[PDB]
Design a binder for this molecule. Structure first.
Ligand SMILES: *[C@@H]1O[C@H](CO)[C@@H](O)[C@H](O)[C@H]1NC(C)=O
Ligand SMILES: *[C@@H]1O[C@H](CO)[C@@H](O)[C@H](O)[C@H]1NC(C)=O
Ligand SMILES: [Os+3]
Ligand SMILES: [Os+3]
Ligand SMILES: [Os+3]
Ligand SMILES: [Os+3]
Ligand SMILES: [Os+3]
Ligand SMILES: [Os+3]
Lengths: 54, 391, 338
């Protein structure tokens, strides 16, 4: 049930809109997205999903 | 039948008690304390551990003035240094020569170690006394575990056991104690929110994982070195780390009455202080009538070997004439000597061998086998060692 | 299992007070935080470089990555060394963290050798004197002994509990971006976002992704820096904060957390004991420094302690209450008079 944030849109932490390969596609906005979700409890679920590729 | 007796508060010493119910054959019970536990009621004040000085990247403001704001953080320190000219690998970090400022920020919190490496400051209240007693009942060893309050009744083999109340309410713990792993210390620790820098309690928290942090470590930020980006500071080193090397010997080594100290829960084990009463309500079935028990006569006692020591260094051979076959209780009527065995099997015109302990050189003692007594004459000799490892 | 945290992060250059000979430098092997919380003596050292990871972000235990001026470069793991007064035994290496068993020293040095044979080191004043576990000062850990509660940093690569703060790196100044074009200043971008400032009336101050020209200007009257918003860097107090973002930060889990374990301590050989009238005589033969402690088992304990170094004979009075003698890690010997 844990939710993460991206500018004005809400999404579940484990399922980001950037996936697959969030850092490979856009390295700047991925770190910016993670920086905005640090206080949130599902941060490490977002960190795991964003840095997964192949 | 309720048998009331009192034994000294000493662990590992087997004591003998004679149960003489009128009209019934005597009964000998062997009692030995396995452990005597004094568990104090604890109230956690706070815990202490190694502190962490959280220092982020300093805000170097090129061609301008950075401003410090008051932050609600433990030992929060903020300073803005003027005339700063720092350097990086490729040269100067700032364009301006004398118009740059550096904002230094630092605060104190609990280290990652606090969950593992920590000392707990407890308040000790009225202690709960408990004892583990070994009883040789009906030719078998039974274990009785009860609170030494003189109220808690434990029934083993239909026999009701009431242990205590303890003659001494003494405990090796003071009103204020400090616990670190397996070691316990009597310490007048500083109260919660009154900790001093570089000393025990420089950082104070409710529990190892709680959010509350009290800090008084004397954090003072210093001006950074010429052309260098860093956050120099003066701080009183960990009071917990200093305490770990300067704490000295714990209560396990210093406590009086030979107290052994254990943790989880914090307790005093085998403190040789005072005595404890024992109430044994022995059921009807355990007793045998004198008429129904074998009658002993024509008794003679010879002591072929005796050495007066703490251990059973005496051997006694008793010749007898029993009326019938059965089990007879063995007890010394003289308080100076103690017999090892409590019960022996009688036949008829046979002989019995018993082991005894005494401190006397000239041992003149009475031995009661069932309801008849026999006089033993013994000339016991001194042993080799003046010191023994048993009491 | 396709997750790689090292692609977002990067090794960096940070301040070091002693890079060798007694002089400060921008070290690729700069020391961050040295943790000595483990009671067993194990040190958790934090460095500016990343071990066990290549420049292409792939995991390789024999490889090491350090910041080579502008871009990160590869180096050999074998070349990495940790030392205080004598060389330390490295037990674990993963990213910014090193686990090492060090002898008694006053300073801590962590170094390595790059692809070009150049040796880089960093020295910090660190008082290292690990505490004695138990009552015996031993040099080697035995397989069997008395179990004592001790702490250590677990050898496991898995990062689950402990964490560090990470953020965007600051603007990297580079004088090579600026050139003198008789008699103007040219800013050669080279596909990078450059933040510039000039003491000339031509161009002001701003951010550029294109080549700029400052008409009637001097190179000494200008400042240029390379911006990097694609990588993460540890929130280091030895590196300046990103002037524009500032409070913007991230967090990553770190390997080797502190854990409660069991330490095996040896028990010193039983001393030869001779008994006397209300007294006990012990001939102590220690192979290493052993703590000798004693107390009376009555109202007045009168505790006494001494560290025995060489062959010593001790005369101890045994009272009516009894005397408890503890010789090192051995269980206490209890004495009573006959
Ligand atoms: C009872 O306990 C004592 C001490 O452990 C032992 O010497 C003895 O043999 C035991 N006797 C029986 C009958 O279990
Ligand atoms: C560590 O401490 C906890 C109790 O809080 C428990 O998991 C365990 O008993 C300990 N493990 C070891 C190896 O000592
Ligand atoms: Os109990
Ligand atoms: Os007599
Ligand atoms: Os990883
Ligand atoms: Os310095
Ligand atoms: Os020291
Ligand atoms: Os030594």
């Amino acid at each position: 049930p844990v939710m993460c944030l991206l500018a004005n849109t809400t999404f579940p932490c484990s399922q980001p809109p950037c996936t697959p390969c969030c850092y490979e596609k856009e390295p700047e906005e991925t770190l910016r997205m993670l920086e905005d979700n640090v206080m949130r409890p599902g941060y490490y679920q977002l960190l795991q999903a964003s840095l997964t590729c192949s | 039948y309720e048998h009331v007796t009192v034994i000294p508060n000493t662990v590992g010493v087997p004591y003998k008690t004679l149960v003489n119910r009128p009209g019934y054959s005597p009964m000998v019970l062997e009692m030995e304390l396995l452990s005597v536990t004094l568990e104090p009621t604890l109230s956690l004040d706070y815990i202490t551990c190694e502190y962490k000085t959280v220092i982020p990247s300093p805000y170097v403001k090129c061609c301008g003035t950075a401003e410090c704001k008051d932050k609600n953080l433990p030992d929060y320190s903020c300073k803005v240094f003027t005339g700063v000219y720092p350097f990086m690998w490729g040269g100067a970090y700032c364009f301006c020569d004398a118009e740059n400022t550096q904002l230094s920020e630092a605060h104190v919190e609990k280290s990652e170690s606090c969950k593992t490496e920590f000392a707990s400051a407890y308040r000790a209240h009225t202690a709960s006394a408990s004892a583990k007693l070994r009883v040789l009942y009906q030719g078998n060893n039974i274990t009785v575990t009860a609170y030494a309050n003189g109220d808690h009744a434990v029934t083993v083999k239909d026999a009701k056991f009431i242990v205590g109340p303890m003659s001494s309410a003494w405990t090796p713990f003071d009103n204020k104690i400090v616990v670190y792993k397996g070691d316990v210390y009597n310490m007048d620790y500083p109260p919660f929110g009154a900790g001093r820098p570089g000393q025990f309690g420089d950082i104070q928290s409710r529990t190892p994982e709680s959010k509350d942090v009290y800090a008084n470590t004397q954090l003072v930020l210093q001006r950074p070195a010429a052309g260098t980006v860093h956050v120099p500071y003066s701080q009183a080193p960990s009071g917990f780390k200093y305490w770990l090397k300067e704490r000295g010997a714990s209560l396990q080594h210093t406590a009086p009455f030979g107290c052994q100290i254990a943790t989880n829960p914090v307790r005093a084990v085998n403190c040789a202080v005072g005595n404890m009463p024992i109430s044994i309500d022995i059921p009807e079935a355990a007793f045998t009538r004198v008429v129904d028990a074998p009658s002993l006569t024509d008794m003679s006692c010879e002591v072929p070997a005796c050495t007066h020591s703490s251990d059973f260094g005496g051997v006694a051979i008793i010749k007898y004439a029993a009326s019938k076959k059965g089990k007879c209780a063995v007890h010394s009527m003289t308080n100076a000597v103690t017999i090892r065995e409590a019960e022996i099997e009688v036949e008829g015109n046979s002989q019995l061998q018993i082991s005894f302990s005494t401190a006397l050189a000239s041992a003149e003692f009475r031995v009661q086998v069932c309801s008849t007594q026999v006089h033993c004459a013994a000339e016991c000799h001194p042993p080799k060692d003046h010191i023994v490892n048993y009491p | 299992d396709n997750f790689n945290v090292y692609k977002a992060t990067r090794p960096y250059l940070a301040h070091c007070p002693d890079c060798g000979e007694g002089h400060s430098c921008h070290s690729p092997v700069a020391l961050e935080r040295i943790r000595n919380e483990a009671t067993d003596g194990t040190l958790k050292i934090q460095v500016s470089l990343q071990i066990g990871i290549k420049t292409d972000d792939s995991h390789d235990w024999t490889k090491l990555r350090y910041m080579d001026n502008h871009m990160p470069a590869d180096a050999e793991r074998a070349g990495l060394f940790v030392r205080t007064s004598a060389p330390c035994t490295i037990t674990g290496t993963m990213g910014h963290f090193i686990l090492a068993r060090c002898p008694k020293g006053e300073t801590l040095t962590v170094g390595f050798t790059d692809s070009r044979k150049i040796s880089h080191s960093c020295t910090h004043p660190f008082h290292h004197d690990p505490p004695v576990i138990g009552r015996e000062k031993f040099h080697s850990r035995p397989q069997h002994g008395k179990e004592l509660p001790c702490s250590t940093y677990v050898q496991s690569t898995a990062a689950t509990t402990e964490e560090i703060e990470v953020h965007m790196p600051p603007d990297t100044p580079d004088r090579t971006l600026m050139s003198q074009q008789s008699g103007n200043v040219k800013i050669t971008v080279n596909g990078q976002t450059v933040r510039y400032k000039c003491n000339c009336g031509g161009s002001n101050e701003g951010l550029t992704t294109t080549d700029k020209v400052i008409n009637n200007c001097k190179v000494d009257q200008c400042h240029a820096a390379v911006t990097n918003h694609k990588k993460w860097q540890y929130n280091s107090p030895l590196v300046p904060r990103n002037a524009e973002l500032g409070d913007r930060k991230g967090k990553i889990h770190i390997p080797f957390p502190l854990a409660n374990v069991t330490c095996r301590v040896p028990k010193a050989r039983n001393p030869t004991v001779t008994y006397g009238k209300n007294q006990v005589i012990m001939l102590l033969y220690p192979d290493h420094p052993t703590l000798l402690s004693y107390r009376n088992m009555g109202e007045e304990p009168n505790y006494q302690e001494e560290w025995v170094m060489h062959k010593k004979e001790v005369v101890l009075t045994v009272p009516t209450e009894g005397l408890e003698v503890t010789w090192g890690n051995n269980e206490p010997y209890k004495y009573w008079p006959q």
